[PDB]
Write a protein that binds this ligand. Structure first.
Ligand SMILES: CC1=C(O)/C(=C\N=C/Cc2ccc(O)cc2)C(COP(=O)(O)O)=CN1
Ligand SMILES: CC1=C(O)/C(=C\N=C/Cc2ccc(O)cc2)C(COP(=O)(O)O)=CN1
Lengths: 382, 382
């Protein structure tokens, strides 16, 4: 508990907080196997402190922090082969996807006002592998989704999309570059061709994959898998999150549009949030500058090294991975996955739960953690 | 800016960032007069550091940080006279208002599914003084707003609301406890009576006022103004933001519902955001514990002292305040307000822009800043 009249000392409240923090898991401890967040680059702690008292909801008061957001967006745009990208460092991939959906809906609204659409709601083709943020957008914005099926490799069925675009009036297409559950990559090149030929907005959700795919060594690329996903394909927008594989503190999400022409369709401030952090843009810019491509490549392929190590140890121990990994994500088929996940928790191993256990090999997962995991899983299986 | 192959040193990137930060204004410098954010309580810098690598989007991994969010919500609920409040420490007042609107809409949706509503969209009574986040919600969620007029004192016209509820089928009422432009307080007691008698959900936007009104000394209360706004009136939800007058770092917004029965109407995670900070809840709990009611009362009435000082100096210098201040907000009538605001900027004074200059007397505004402001404004007026 209740609000009290008298205050307490700093030592008292800090000691209480540290007691609660001790109940948390920590990324570096070998417990967390199912998270797409990880330890932040240590330099970001100083940056957060420097920029803590900024607010990109009032950029007129923080001109330098606003310039750093623009520079962060420019570095992401350059990474994605688009020097003219218009975008924002937002709160996460959810706000980024919601902003893309707002844009899609407002393009549709303009058509409706001219009589150029028989759809009473925007009609959007969305693969069934789409992240839950897309359901939040549908539920809030009254969108109609045409759920696209996936093929045997768990990527979107491009022929279905092409057929649906022929039959139906379609207002948007979603493709995923690094799905949440398995890390697979939709055929963005074909989707973008369908979209361009039919004048349909295409959004690429690269929340996770956007900071992984551009850095993959050829050893980890698979024949037949297409890795192109960015603005070189002419897509309309891309979600890409520094607080996932960019080692930046939450909140650091990213939404990039092809050019500034898209800004007018975000009119109602283009972000959903009002008051909002300035340190996300500063950290995004600084981490990408500090690492350069070489530093991020090292981290990404270190994760891929450990991902393929985990995949190999799984098969050696007669476990069945859902797929050979595409990104730093592996899933283990298990009919008793719910109970096995709970047994793993009791032994200090936290995976996520497709009837499978899901492991995200973030930079905090080392070979010793994978060895420990296999030992505990073997033991659980009798 | 362009992405580079080679990284740069920490000294290089920190020096670049500090150069951009030097272009920002800082709260403590006597420049910022129109912001509802201010300096954070210094202890929160340590808390941010401790909880930087947490994520309340995956609370199963951070049980202690999640408990601290629940305790933060409980302290706010206790402040608002509701020990059973269900709520979240979200990204800000915008997400908080959007979540209340989602709840209103889902209550309406349940009625529509039963044939209990002739409204094709939720119909919500909203005063014309409402914050822009309400327009974001209307635009995203396809809500129908009945804009309520305001009286001569700039508070919502309760008779209009009562008449509209008699004539129309209404799905929600919004009342504001501390408006953005003038800091006035709607007659929540009467609105809540109308709402309860007609079975209408009522949301109170106390984003700013929620951490001011409960701490006002009687000297600053005005005869005829009602200051009751919280769950003692039986309202359904209240937005209240620690990163406004709670001295907590962004992002620290708050949304409290009357009880846990409201959670089911937030189903599609109840927050809009997915991955999200854990330090907002930790800071909210710790700042309120560290200060206690006595510490927040001191700060609030210090701001009110300087607010009434500013109001007195304005009248002494023949300026016309829009209203005698209710909260720590004063607005100066000026036909040339746009040009005067620009002239003030050129002289280092940043107000916001009702045909008036708006000053928010946050804790960083001291008597010397108000004296400086009057001198510059006098000088500008020839
Ligand atoms: C493809 C895609 C995603 O996998 C995704 C998040 N995914 C996973 C978010 C997560 C992170 C850590 C953790 O412990 C649990 C979950 C989002 C939303 O991104 P967010 O708002 O930053 O969470 C969009 N697209
Ligand atoms: C009554 C009400 C508000 O005045 C409000 C914000 N108000 C002002 C936000 C602001 C803060 C600092 C600044 O420099 C400029 C603007 C919000 C939204 O709160 P937010 O998402 O935390 O910005 C809701 N209701």
């Amino acid at each position: 508990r209740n609000m009290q009249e008298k205050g307490v000392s700093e030592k008292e409240i800090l000691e209480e907080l540290k007691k609660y923090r001790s109940l948390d898991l920590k990324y570096e401890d070998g417990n967390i196997f199912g998270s797409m967040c990880s330890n932040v680059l240590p330099i970001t702690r100083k940056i957060v402190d420097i920029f803590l008292e900024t607010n990109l909801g009032d950029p007129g008061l923080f001109k330098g922090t606003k310039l750093l957001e623009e520079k962060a967006v420019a570095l992401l745009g350059s990474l994605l082969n688009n020097k003219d990208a218009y975008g924002h460092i937002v709160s996460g991939g959810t706000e980024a996807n919601l902003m893309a959906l707002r844009c899609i809906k407002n393009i549709w609204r303009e058509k409706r006002r001219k009589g150029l659409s028989k759809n009473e709601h925007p009609k959007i083709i969305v693969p069934i592998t789409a992240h839950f943020s897309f359901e939040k957008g549908r539920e809030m914005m009254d969108l109609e989704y045409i759920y696209a099926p996936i093929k045997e490799d768990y990527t979107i069925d491009e022929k279905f999309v092409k057929d649906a675009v022929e039959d139906y009036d379609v207002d948007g297409i979603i493709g995923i570059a690094g799905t949440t559950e398995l890390g697979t990559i939709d055929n963005i090149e074909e989707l973008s061709k369908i979209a361009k030929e039919n004048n349909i907005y295409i959004h690429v959700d690269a929340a996770f994959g956007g900071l992984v795919i551009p850095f993959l060594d050829d050893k980890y690329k698979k024949k037949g898998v297409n890795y192109k996903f960015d603005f070189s394909l002419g897509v309309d927008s891309i979600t890409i999150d520094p607080h996932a594989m960019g080692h930046c503190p939450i909140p650091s999400g990213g939404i990039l549009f092809k050019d500034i022409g898209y800004k007018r369709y975000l009119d109602v401030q283009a972000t959903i949030l009002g008051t909002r952090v300035g340190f996300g843009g500063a950290c995004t810019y600084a981490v990408l500058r500090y690492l350069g491509r070489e530093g991020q490549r090292k981290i990404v392929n270190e994760c891929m090294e450990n991902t393929l190590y985990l995949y190999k140890k799984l098969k050696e121990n007669n476990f069945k991975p859902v797929i050979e990994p595409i990104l730093n994500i592996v899933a283990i088929e298990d009919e008793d996955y719910k109970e096995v996940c709970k047994k793993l928790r009791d032994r200090g191993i936290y995976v996520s739960v497709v009837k499978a256990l899901r492991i995200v090999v973030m930079p905090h997962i080392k070979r010793e953690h994978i060895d420990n995991f296999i030992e505990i899983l073997n033991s659980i299986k009798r």
